[PDB]
Structures are given as C-alpha cells and as structure tokens.
C-alpha cells in the first residue's frame with residue numbers, strides 16, 4: 100500500500116522445495132531503526148557491486164523497501180509497528196534482508212523480531228561463526244572457532260506464554276497447578292509470575308533434520324545436540340532424545356561403540372559425521388577450552404541465543420556476526436546487532452553483520468560467485484587494517500574508516 | 514543411624530542470625546562419588562593444617578561423615594540415595610561440606626544436589642570467581658576478572674515442574690492452556706513436553722538483598738541484575754524490577770541521573786555502589802570483552818548456572834572453582850565439578866575446588882585466619898608451578914603432582 104513494487108524485476112518462485120531465482124529478482128529489505136540508516140546503504144552498495152562483478156552485468160537485484168518498527172509508524176501511522184503487508188510480502192517474494200529493529204516499551208508490544216519469526220514460521224535461526232584473520236579477539240586462539248549454530252526458533256520459553264504476578268490469570272494457572280495437578284514445588288505461590296516452556300517432537304525433529312542435512316551438504320565433521328536435559332528432562336531432555344532418534348531413523352545412525360554417540364555416513368563424501376550431545380553449561384566452558392571439537396551445533400531457542408552471543412564475542416565478531424531465519428516458504432536474513440541510537444546517522448558503525456548476512460542471502464539464492472566475492476572483500480579490508488572504529492580501537496597500525504568507506508574498502512578488496 | 518557422631522566436638526549454634534562457633538565444632542562432610550574419594554582426604558588434611566597453623570592448637574574441627582549418593586546405597590541399602598537424616602544433620606549442625614555426587618538414570622530420581630538445595634531451602638548459590646596468578650587461561654587478560662555470582666537457588670525452571678510429551682498430565686495442562694487460558698502460541702500441541710518457570714517477589718528480593726548486603730560488607734563497586742527480561746517479561750523482567758525496587762526501598766537507592774541505574778551509598782565506606790542491569794545474552798559477551806565493569810552479579814537459577822560456568826572457564830578455573838549454598842538456617846559448601854569416574858582412586862585430579870570451598874566455609878565460621886592461610890597456600894603452589902595434571906598440561910616449566918601431593922604443596926606455601 101505504501102510499498103512501491105519495482106517496475107523492472109521479477110519474483111523468486113518456489114518450485115517444490117527449490118528456489119527459482121530470475122536474473123533480476125525483487126528482494127524486499129527492511130532498513131532498520133537506529134544505525135540501520137547507516138549500515139543498510141553500505142550493504143546495498145557492496146551487494147550491487149559484488150553481483151556486478153560476478154555476472155558481468157547479466158544479473159541485477161531490484162531492491163524493494165518494506166517497513167517494520169519505528170520507520171513503519173512514520174509511514175503508516177503511530178499505531179503500526181508491524182504492518183500486515185510486510186508479512187505477506189516476505190512470504191510472497193521469498194527472501195528478504197533486514198537491519199536492526201526497535202520494539203517500544205509501555206505499549207504491551209512483544210519483540211517485533213520474534214513476531215516476524217513466529218508469524219512466518221521461520222523455524223531455523225542459522226548463525227555461522229568463524230574467525231576472520233586479523234579481527235581483534237579477547238581469546239588467545241580464535242582461529243580454532245568455526246561453528247554453525249542451528250537454533251530452534253518456533254518454541255521454548257520464547258513462545259511468550261506467560262502471566263503477571265498477582266494477575267487474575269496467574270492466580271488461576273497457579274490454582275490449576277496446585278489443586279488439579281498437585282504441584283507442591285512452587286516455593287512462593289503468591290506474587291508469582293509464571294512462564295510456560297513447550298518442546299514438541301515435530302519442533303525439534305524439523306530443526307535437527309536441517310542441521311544434519313547441512314552437515315552432509317557441507318561435509319562438516321559433527322553435529323552436537325546441546326541441552327540442559329539433566330534438569331529439564333521433558334523438554335530439553337526430550338530434544339536430545341528426539342535428535343538422536345531422528346539421526347538413527349532417518350540418517351542411518353550407528354552406535355560409536357557403547358554409545359551414546361552416533362555415526363552418520365555422508366552419502367556423498369563417505370566420511371562419518373559424529374552425532375553427539377553435551378550439557379549446556381559445560382558446553383559454555385568447552386567452546387572456550389576446546390573449540391576445535393565442535394562444528395555444527397543444534398539447540399533450542401534460549402540456549403542458541405546464549406551460545407550464539409558468547410561465540411560471536413570470542414572471535415571478536417560481536418559486530419560482524421551474520422544471521423538467517425529460515426522456514427520452508429521464506430527466509431529473512433539480518434543484522435544480528437542492535438540499533439545503537441547514539442551513533443545513528445554518524446556513519447561510524449560496522450556494516451559487517453548485515454553485509455555478511457547479505458552474502459548468506461546470496462548463497463541461498465544460488466548466487467555463490469557474488470557471495471564469495473563479498474567474503475573475499477571482507478577478509479581483504481580487515482587484513483589491510485582498513486577498518487571502522489570498533490576494530491581500530493583494539494588494533495595498532497590500523498586506518499580508521501567510516502561505515503560507508505568500509506563498504507568501499509570491501510568492494511576494493513573484491 | 515549409621516553416622517557416628519564425634520565424641521569430642523560441639524555443635525555450632527545459631528543465636529539469632531549470628532553463628533556461635535565453638536573451638537571444637539562438629540562439621541559434617543559428604544565425601545562424594547567418583548573423584549570425591551581423592552579430593553575430600555586432601556581437603557580434610559589442608560583444612561586441619563590451616564587451623565593448626567592459625568590458632569596454634571586452640572581450635573580443632575571434629576569431622577563427621579554423612580551420606581548421599583552412591584556411597585549412601587552402600588551404607589543404608591540399594592534404594593536410598595538421599596537419607597532423611599542427612600537433611601536433619603545438615604540443618605542441626607549448621608555448616609557442611611561436600612564432594613561431587615552421582616544421581617542415577619533409569620529410576621526417576623531428580624538431581625540429588627538440587628534436592629538438597631530445595632529441601633533445605635538453601636536459596637543463595639554463591640560462586641566467587643577470581644584469577645589466581647599463574648593458572649593457565651584461554652583468554653588474554655584473565656586477571657581482569659573478579660566477580661561474585663549470587664544465583665537464586667529455589668525457583669526458576671529448576672523447580673522441576675514438568676510433564677512428559679503424550680503423557681496424560683501433559684495432555685491435561687495443554688488442554689487447560691488452550692481451552693481455559695486460550696493460548697494460541699503452542700506451535701505443535703501434540704507430542705509436546707511442558708515446563709513451568711515460576712518467579713516470585715519473595716524469591717527474588719531475598720536473593721537480591723543478600724547480594725547488595727554482600728557488596729556493602731565487602732565494599733564491592735556494583736551489583737548487576739542479569740536477566741532476559743525483554744523476552745520473559747513476567748519472570749525475568751519481574752526479577753529485574755523487584756531488584757531495583759528493593760535497592761530503592763531498603764537501601765535508599767537514587768537515580769544515577771535519568772536512570773535506570775541506581776546508586777546505593779555504602780553505610781560504612783561512604784562509597785557508591787552502582788545497581789545496574791544487563792540482558793543475559795549481551796552479558797555473556799560483556800564478561801569476555803569488558804570484565805572489569807562487573808563485580809557482584811545477581812541473577813536467576815539457570816542464568817547463574819551458565820554465567821558461573823562460563824566465567825570459571827575464562828580464568829582457567831573449571832577445576833578450582835569454589836561454591837556455597839546458603840540458606841537462613843544452614844549452609845552447604847561444595848566441590849563444583851563432577852565425579853569424573855575414569856580418574857577415581859588414581860590420586861590425580863585437582864583438589865582445588867573443594868579446598869577453596871573449605872576456605873569459604875571457614876570464612877563463614879568466622880575463622881578468617883585459617884581461611885587466609887589456605888588462599889596463601891593456593892597462590893603459592895600455583896605460582897611455584899607445583900601443580901596437578903590439568904594445569905601442568907598447559908604449562909611449560911611445571912612440576913607434575915598427584916592430588917594428595919598438591920595438598921601438601923598448599924600446606925607448604927602457607
């Protein structure tokens with residue numbers, strides 16, 4: 100309604116599982132709030148330059164601005180933070196990319212990003228974290244990290260099923276729990292908020308199936324189910340058991356003698372993928388002390404939220420970390436950082452995260468050459484120490500660049 | 514009944530909040546399973562040596578072996594993993610110390626440690642993590658870490674209120690949620706496990722009150738409430754708000770202009786303690802990138818479980834990390850690592866964690882001099898590079914010591 104759908108440009112089609120990408124596809128983008136005003140122009144410019152370089156003018160993207168968050172209230176009216184047509188348009192045009200979003204407090208509006216994820220059933224939150232040589236890191240050996248996080252995105256305590264302390268509703272489910280379910284384990288039943296954590300069989304098998312499949316397709320060495328199953332037996336513990344069960348039943352998993360670990364043979368390279376599990380708090384130590392043991396990681400919503408963030412900080416990538424939200428009908432790639440409003444409009448923040456989510460987008464479209472040119476550009480700029488303020492603070496011998504100038508530096512190292 | 518209560522030795526008394534410790538107190542200890550057989554003898558010997566040194570023979574501890582876990586089935590019978598008298602004896606004798614415990618799988622027996630914590634209402638899990646100079650660390654600057662974790666121990670998803678997928682009970686609470694509570698947010702209501710996360714006002718105020726009080730008594734610079742309140746508004750978000758509310762109402766907190774942060778003035782040193790909050794996934798990055806900003810940490814059960822573990826791994830202390838479980842009537846100090854059965858009986862693992870939980874025990878008894886002699890001994894042994902295998906693997910120029918020999922090395926550096 101306020102989106103101006105591009106004159107040239109053609110819709111991507113989903114021809115039974117497979118994406119059918121034209122040479123001039125229309126790609127929706129949500130600019131983002133705060134520093135989205137800085138990083139999204141830098142990403143449109145380097146993506147455009149990378150497909151110009153790779154396909155020598157044969158392919159072109161027709162970018163289409165759609166709206167969510169704060170810019171949405173400025174376009175449609177004060178009350179509309181998530182327009183219904185943004186949801187239809189992501190679904191229709193199949194892939195989209197976004198900058199950081201603001202959700203308001205004081206209005207009873209739950210996280211707009213989690214609303215997108217659940218409303219479009221984008222059940223895979225894919226977070227790849229690897230070290231880019233030369234980025235300043237807090238740990239001694241960040242180069243030992245090359246993991247890919249498959250975080251379940253549609254259930255867990257993130258579903259948002261909760262009630263306020265002293266509210267009538269909370270009173271009522273605490274009454275049901277104590278009287279009809281006989282729970283004697285609530286220490287203080289009065290002035291008590293209640294949260295519901297659900298974990299289903301379809302929810303975890305569709306996420307784990309995607310993780311094992313990614314390991315076969317990219318012949319990764321292992322898939323680690325991380326969970327806190329010793330304490331949460333029927334949600335987290337069920338996740339781990341449904342994950343091992345699916346590796347056995349669908350991928351022909353075999354005991355690595357005695358168990359619990361399984362072996363899956365890659366149907367293409369002939370190698371064996373270890374399917375293993377580790378408890379979540381011990382995993383938080385293991386990624387620091389033994390990061391070379393792990394590769395593809397499958398976990399639930401909250402655990403994936405924490406694992407992702409801790410892992411991005413150890414390779415020095417809190418501001419260059421990419422992210423994808425993938426469902427069966429569409430996908431939404433994104434800047435994984437926040438809006439940082441203090442710096443907005445100053446052209447100073449790292450455009451790295453949304454640019455690396457744009458290469459994930461391209462790679463997903465099958466435009467691998469363009470995707471490869473962007474990570475070449477990225478490795479070059481960082482190695483040339485021609486970098487933005489967040490990196491330059493920690494580097495000795497670096498040249499300080501603006502957000503936009505680092506965009507040009509990526510195009511220059513392509 | 515099978516505990517032989519010591520002939521010499523007198524019970525510690527609780528004279529209205531205050532502990533009344535005799536010169537010869539009876540202290541219960543649970544040896545532990547696995548490597549408990551190695552580390553608990555090393556701790557009894559260095560504690561004994563430290564109080565012998567500090568009080569020149571005037572004070573003596575009368576150790577009393579009590580039973581839980583696997584050794585309990587060997588003493589009382591196959592069916593008894595947690596004897597009822599262990600609970601009465603910890604409560605009666607007021608302080609106790611324990612090694613690592615095994616909980617069995619296949620019997621429907623929930624974690625024995627969480628049973629101790631909840632059954633005795635030991636609502637504070639106190640975890641201090643600081644760097645001991647010379648321990649091998651994965652990060653560049655571990656010496657910047659000196660934090661004290663106040664983890665709420667009696668509620669959260671750890672309460673153990675959950676139901677199995679496809680069980681009649683799960684069917685029933687999913688029916689109540691959908692029909693009587695009208696929840697439309699469960700993606701897959703079939704084959705769905707359910708967990709209940711409770712968070713009450715009394716539960717978080719009693720934990721936060723203990724954290725702020727510890728900051729005043731040890732004049733620590735700040736108290737950080739960590740939570741994932743943007744997603745879990747009525748449990749995690751309520752925790753943060755009840756924490757700020759208690760700092761205002763009981764400690765005379767004032768806005769550090771504009772807020773949300775508060776200032777508490779230490780009634781003794783005159784300094785100002787910053788009361789702040791940070792979101793839990795961003796905190797996991799912040800402890801790596803800016804560890805000097807944080808000091809005392811107050812958080813809920815699961816978050817404290819993760820924070821504790823990640824923090825112990827960055828200062829190279831996964832095997833020397835101390836821990837206390839403190840309630841109003843008693844306390845239970847502990848080895849925070851597992852049973853490691855492969856190495857049990859070999860005299861090779863680090864006795865560091867249970868020995869440093871024994872100095873926390875002593876310090877809590879008011880036997881500060883003895884406590885101080887143990888951390889002096891610890892700093893000496895580690896600095897002398899006269900160390901056990903887990904440290905020696907990562908050190909160049911170290912002498913390898915057995916579990917028991919490192920005990921003697923601590924006594925020697927006292």
Ligand SMILES: [Mg+2]
Nearest residue numbers: 404407408794
């Ligand atoms: Mg996150």
Ligand SMILES: [Mg+2]
Nearest residue numbers: 380818821822
């Ligand atoms: Mg732990």
